[PDB]
């Protein structure tokens, strides 16, 4: 039962180190673009487990829950960081400070331009809302905790997991409410802003689902990194 | 610029007629279960366009936006009504008053039991939150208006569509906030409840995505019904 400022301060401190990758500097189509992307993701996934372990309450979940949450929201988590990095750069996807792809460079891979457009539009919604860093922190932690687990346990086991996850999501909501109240907008505007940010969660989920199907059409040590 | 009570009163009045279908009364596996399901959905989709046209602001959207919203959220809309119908019936999916399938009867179709479990768990979250009818109305209207449109227009055209849709989603948020405030819970609990309901939107999106892929692995008159 800690405060919203504690929780947001732990989130800021848990932020992974920005992963530096460089363009291959020798333009490629499907081959090198994805190759660099795959190396970037893999570095980011190593830091994602370290960050997940610092989200308040996450390590008090069973390891079975921890593993399932991460297995279903890793791409959403990757995507929302890409969106935040690209927010102040209309038309480009800043995958890393030295790996900035423009919208039309997505024509090189197998139908990734419509996925890149989804990502740019979600990024524009964030820019339009003027998403603040602290709001972004709550939203990313909420993507991990509101993840769908699969496969499913019995209805009774699932309910126990849900109760717990719901208690942790409520602490993050309290912190986001608190972050929103510091802007001094009215009560009505504070609910609308809470709602605007939460509704983009369904868009991040949708893009992730597409991205995963898209990666899979072109193509287990979690615990080891988790218990360390 | 009408009131939240106006908007919720229009939602209640726009509710489609409950579609009655009966079990074939002669048990079948993959054949008849899906056959009945397909007829049920098709009747419901006819009423879904009539209901969409009554959501405040929907008909003031261009027909291109209207068509894209409905093309991407129809399964979510179907699913959330099924969830609401099944809410007070643990273990069963009430697809229609005379078409009540128990959890284990999903073993008859091609891997639909895990999809049926997703639906039952989302339904249990709703039951656990004690979802009220008026809250449900706002949530279903929000699924239609927060739908992803595809394919995407230019970044500029999309922004114009987003602004408009955002204005309509804010009117629905205002109405849900108002519905929530009538329970008399505290301010803190009201935000948490707003957030609990909005976070299940991402779960409805996810299940829809699965359901669509699942239907498609086993297997254009919108405007005509829209302009009438
Ligand atoms: O390009 C990638 C990407 C590429 C390969 C990936 O996975 C590598 C495989 N790896 C195998 C072992 C288990 C972990 C995943 C993941 C993301 C990224 C994205 C993407 C875009 C469109 C699409 O259709 C699919 C994905 S989004 C993104 C954000 C990042 O910060 C990093 C990479 C990315
Ligand atoms: O079984 C269906 C269902 C069956 C056929 C459907 O589509 C019929 C095809 N029709 C073709 C013309 C365009 C409109 C769709 C739709 C839903 C329903 C669902 C489902 C469940 C699991 C799964 O993997 C996929 C779908 S959920 C649902 C809720 C309803 O109220 C009615 C049917 C349903």
Swiss-Prot record, chains A, B:
Residues 3-228 form the NR LBD domain. Expressed in the CA1 region of the hippocampus, expression decreases with age (at protein level). Expressed in prostate, ovary, lung, liver, kidney, fat, bone, brain, uterus and testis. Keywords: Activator, DNA-binding, Glycoprotein, Lipid-binding, Metal-binding, Nucleus, Phosphoprotein, Receptor, Steroid-binding, Transcription, Transcription regulation, Zinc, Zinc-finger. Its main location: nucleus. One of its GO terms (biological process) is cellular response to magnetism. Signal peptide: none annotated. It comes from the Eukaryota. One of its GO terms (molecular function) is sequence-specific DNA binding. It is found in: Nucleus. One of its GO terms (cellular component) is perinuclear region of cytoplasm. Composed of three domains: a modulating N-terminal domain, a DNA-binding domain and a C-terminal ligand-binding domain. Binds DNA as a homodimer. Can form a heterodimer with ESR1. Interacts with NCOA1, NCOA3, NCOA5 and NCOA6 coactivators, leading to a strong increase of transcription of target genes. Interacts with UBE1C and AKAP13. Interacts with DNTTIP2. Interacts with CCDC62 in the presence of estradiol/E2; this interaction seems to enhance the transcription of target genes. Interacts with PRMT2. Interacts with CCAR2 (via N-terminus) in a ligand-independent manner. Interacts with DNAAF4. Interacts with RBM39, in the presence of estradiol (E2). Interacts with STUB1/CHIP. Belongs to the nuclear hormone receptor family. NR3 subfamily. This is Estrogen receptor beta.
């Amino acid at each position: 039962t800690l405060s919203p400022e504690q929780l947001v301060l732990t989130l800021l401190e848990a932020e992974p180190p920005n992963v530096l990758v460089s363009r291959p500097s020798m333009p490629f189509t499907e081959a090198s673009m994805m190759m660099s992307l795959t190396k970037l993701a893999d570095k980011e996934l190593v830091h994602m487990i370290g960050w997940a372990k610092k989200i308040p309450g996450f390590v008090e979940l069973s390891l079975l829950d921890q593993v399932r949450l991460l297995e279903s929201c890793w791409m959403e988590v990757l995507m929302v960081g890409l969106m935040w990095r690209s927010i102040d750069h209309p038309g480009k996807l800043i995958f890393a400070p030295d790996l900035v792809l423009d919208r039309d460079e997505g024509k090189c891979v197998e139908g990734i331009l419509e996925i890149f457009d989804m990502l740019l539009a979600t990024t524009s919604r964030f820019r339009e809302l003027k998403l603040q860093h602290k709001e972004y922190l709550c939203v990313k932690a909420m993507i991990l905790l509101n993840s769908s687990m699969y496969p499913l346990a019995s209805a009774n086991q699932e309910a126990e997991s849900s109760r717990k996850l719901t208690h942790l999501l409520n602490a993050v909501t309290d912190a986001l409410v608190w972050v929103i109240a510091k802007s001094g907008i009215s009560s009505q505007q504070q609910s609308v802003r809470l709602a605007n940010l939460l509704m983009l969660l369904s868009h991040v989920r949708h893009i992730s689902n597409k991205g995963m199907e898209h990666l899979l059409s072109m193509k287990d040590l979690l615990l080891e990194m988790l218990n360390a």
